Amino acid sequence: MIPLTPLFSRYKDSYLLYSFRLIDLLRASKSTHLTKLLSSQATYLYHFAIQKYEVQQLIEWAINASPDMDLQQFRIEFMDKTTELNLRSCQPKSFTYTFTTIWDTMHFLSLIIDDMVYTRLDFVMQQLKTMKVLFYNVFFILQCAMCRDHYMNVKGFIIYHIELIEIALDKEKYGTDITFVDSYQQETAGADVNNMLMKNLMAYVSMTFHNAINDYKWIQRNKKPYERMTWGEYKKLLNL
Amino acid sequence: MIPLTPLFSRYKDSYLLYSFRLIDLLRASKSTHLTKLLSSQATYLYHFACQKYEVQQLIEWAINASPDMDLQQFRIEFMDKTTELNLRSCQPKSFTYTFTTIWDTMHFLSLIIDDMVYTRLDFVMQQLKTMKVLFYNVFFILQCAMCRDHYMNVKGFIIYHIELIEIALDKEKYGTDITFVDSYQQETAGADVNNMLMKNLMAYVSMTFHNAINDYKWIQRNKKPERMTWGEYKKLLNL
Numbered sequence: 243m244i245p246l247t248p249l250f251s252r253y254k255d256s257y258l259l260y261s262f263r264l265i266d267l268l269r270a271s272k273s274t275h276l277t278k279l280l281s282s283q284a285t286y287l288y289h290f291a292i293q294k295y296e297v298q299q300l301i302e303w304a305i306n307a308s309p310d311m312d313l314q315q316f317r318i319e320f321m322d323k324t325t326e327l328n329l330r331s332c333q334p335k336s337f338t339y340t341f342t343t344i345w346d347t348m349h350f351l352s353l354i355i356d357d358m359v360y361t362r363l364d365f366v367m368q369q370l371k372t373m374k375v376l377f378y379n380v381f382f383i384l385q386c387a388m389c390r391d392h393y394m395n396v397k398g399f400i401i402y403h404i405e406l407i408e409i410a411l412d413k414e415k416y417g418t419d420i421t422f423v424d425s426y427q428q429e430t431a432g433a434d435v436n437n438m439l440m441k442n443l444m445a446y447v448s449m450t451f452h453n454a455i456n457d458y459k460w461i462q463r464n465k466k467p468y469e470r471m472t473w474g475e476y477k478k479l480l481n482l
Numbered sequence: 483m484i485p486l487t488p489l490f491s492r493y494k495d496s497y498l499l500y501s502f503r504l505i506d507l508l509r510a511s512k513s514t515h516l517t518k519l520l521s522s523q524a525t526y527l528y529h530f531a532c533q534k535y536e537v538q539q540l541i542e543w544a545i546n547a548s549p550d551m552d553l554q555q556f557r558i559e560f561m562d563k564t565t566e567l568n569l570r571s572c573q574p575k576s577f578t579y580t581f582t583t584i585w586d587t588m589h590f591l592s593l594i595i596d597d598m599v600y601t602r603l604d605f606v607m608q609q610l611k612t613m614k615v616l617f618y619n620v621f622f623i624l625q626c627a628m629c630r631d632h633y634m635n636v637k638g639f640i641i642y643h644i645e646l647i648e649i650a651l652d653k654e655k656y657g658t659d660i661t662f663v664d665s666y667q668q669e670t671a672g673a674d675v676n677n678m679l680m681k682n683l684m685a686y687v688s689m690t691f692h693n694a695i696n697d698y699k700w701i702q703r704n705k706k707p708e709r710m711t712w713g714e715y716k717k718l719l720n721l
C-alpha cells in the first residue's frame with residue numbers, strides 16, 4: 243500500500259473534495275452523455291478511494307438531487323447522505339477547491355496505479371483501463387478555458403505510459419517477468435532493443451507532466467519564467 | 483534539409499497521397515465545423531510539404547467540387563486542377579492508401595519539425611503550434627474505429643514533445659541556448675534539476691510511438707505477440 247505522509251494526506255482529501263465536486267454537477271447536467279460520463283467517472287473515483295453498493299446509492303441520490311439547490315445546500319444534503327449510508331470516509335475535510343485539488347487528484351491516481359502494479363493480472367489490466375478513462379475525462383470544474391484546451395492536447399502523455407504498463411503486464415502474462423528499475427532512463431533504454439518497468443513510473447510521469455504544464459504557461463502569458471519539483475525531492479516528500 | 487533517401491521519398495509521396503485524400507472529403511462534409519477543419523488541415527499540410535496562393539485555389543476548388551462525383555472522378559479533376567495551377571508537385575505517384583500512408587505522413591511531419599529546429603525565432607515557435615494542430619487532427623480516412631479511439635487516447639504523447647521543443651526555444655529566446663544531445667535519456671535526465679534537446683527528437687518520438695501502437699494491438703486482439711530500433715531507423719533515413 244501507499245506510504246502515509248503529510249503530502250499523501252492532502253492528496254486523499256483533495257481526491258474526496260474533487261469527487262464531491264464532480265457529483266454536484268450531476269443534478270445540473272444538460273445532456274444524457276454528460277450524465278453518463280459524470281456518473282461513471284465518480285463511480286470509478288470512489289472505487290479507487292459493501293462500499294460499492296453504498297456508492298451506487300450515493301451516486302443515484304446525486305442524479306436526482308434538486309437542480310435548484312446551490313452548491314452549499316448540496317454540500318449539506320451530501321454530508322447527511324454519506325453519514326446515512328455509512329460513508330463518512332467519503333466526506334472531505336476541506337472544501338477549498340483550487341488547482342492543487344486537481345493536481346493532487348491526478349498525483350493520487352498515479353500513486354494508486356504504481357501500488358496496484360508493484361503489489362499485483364487480469365484484474366490489474368482491467369483497472370489500468372479504468373484509469374485511462376479517468377485521465378481522459380478529467381474535468382476542471384473551476385473556470386480555466388485555456389487549461390482545458392491545453393490538457394486535451396497533451397493528456398495522452400500520461401495515458402501512453404499507462405499503456406506501456408499494460409504492454410509490460412501482457413508480456414508477464416505470456417512468459418517474460420517484469421523487471422523493475424529505479425530510473426526512467428533505464429526503462430526507456432530498454433524499450434529500444436526483456437520487460438523493464440520503472441518503479442513508481444506514474445508518480446514520475448505525472449510529476450514530469452506537472453512541471454511541463456508550469457514551464458509551458460510562461461509561453462502562454464509571455465513572460466520570462468523559481469523552484470521546480472525534482473524526482474529526488476518528490477520521492478522524499480512521499481516516502482517512495 | 484532532410485536527407486534525401488529511399489524511405490524519405492516514400493514518406494513524401496505518402497504525404498501527398500494523404501493530402502489528396504483529405505481534400506476529397508471536403509465535397510462530402512456534413513458540417514460547417516468539419517469543413518472548417520479539413521480545409522485548415524489541408525492548407526497546413528501543403529504549407530509544410532517539404533505557392534500558397536495556388537494552394538488556396540486548389541482548396542477552394544475542392545470545396546466546390548460536385549458531391550456526387552466518386553473518388554476516382556475526383557482524382558481525374560484533381561490531376562487536372564493541380565496541372566493547371568502549376569502544382570504537379572502536389573500530385574502523388576501512388577494512390578494505394580493504407581496504414582503505411584498514415585504512418586509515413588506522421589513520420590514525415592516529425593522529420594519536418596526536427597529540420598526546422600536544428601536549422602532555425604517566433605517563426606519556428608509559430609510553426610510548432612500548427613504542427614500541434616495537425617497531429618491533434620489526424621484523420622484515418624480508411625475504416626478503423628478502434629484506431630481512431632486508440633489515437634485520440636494517446637496522441638498527446640507526440641504533442642507533449644512538441645511542447646518540450648517550444649519550451650526549449652522559449653528558454654533560448656530569453657538567454658539559455660539549446661544544447662543538442664544524442665540520446666533521449668540525456669534530455670529527460672536534464673529536465674530534472676540547462677536546456678538540452680535530443681537531436682532528431684520527433685523522429686525518435688514518433689518511432690517509439692509507432693512501436694507502442696503495434697505492441698498494444700496484441701492486447702487488443704488477445705494474442706501472444708520484429709520491432710524497429712532507433713539505430714536501424716536512423717540508418718534508414720541518414721540522420
Ligand SMILES: Cc1cc2nc3c(=O)[nH]c(=O)nc-3n(C[C@H](O)[C@H](O)[C@H](O)COP(=O)(O)OP(=O)(O)OC[C@H]3O[C@@H](n4cnc5c(N)ncnc54)[C@H](O)[C@@H]3O)c2cc1C
Binds near residue numbers: 392449452453462471
Ligand atoms: C491538468 C492541469 C492542466 C493545467 N493547465 C494550465 C495552463 O494551460 N495554463 C496555466 O496558466 N495554468 C494551468 N494549470 C494550473 C497550473 O498548472 C498551476 O496550478 C497554476 O497555474 C499555478 O500554480 P502554482 O505554481 O502556484 O502551484 P501548482 O503548480 O498547482 O502545485 C501546487 C502543489 O502541487 C505540488 N507540486 C508542485 N509542482 C509539482 C510537480 N512538478 N510535481 C508534483 N507535485 C508538484 C506541490 O505540493 C505544490 O504545493 C493546470 C492544472 C492541471 C491540474
Ligand SMILES: Cc1cc2nc3c(=O)[nH]c(=O)nc-3n(C[C@H](O)[C@H](O)[C@H](O)COP(=O)(O)OP(=O)(O)OC[C@H]3O[C@@H](n4cnc5c(N)ncnc54)[C@H](O)[C@@H]3O)c2cc1C
Binds near residue numbers: 582584589696715
Ligand atoms: C495513429 C495510428 C494509430 C493506429 N492505432 C491502431 C490500433 O489501435 N489497433 C490496430 O490494430 N492498428 C492500429 N494502427 C495501424 C497499425 O499501427 C499498423 O499500421 C497495422 O496494424 C499494419 O501493421 P504492419 O506491422 O504490417 O505495418 P506498419 O506498422 O504500418 O509499418 C509499415 C511501415 O512502416 C515502417 N515502420 C514499421 N515500424 C516502424 C516504426 N516503429 N517506426 C517507423 N517506421 C516503422 C516500416 O518501414 C514499414 O514498412 C494505427 C496506425 C496509426 C498511423
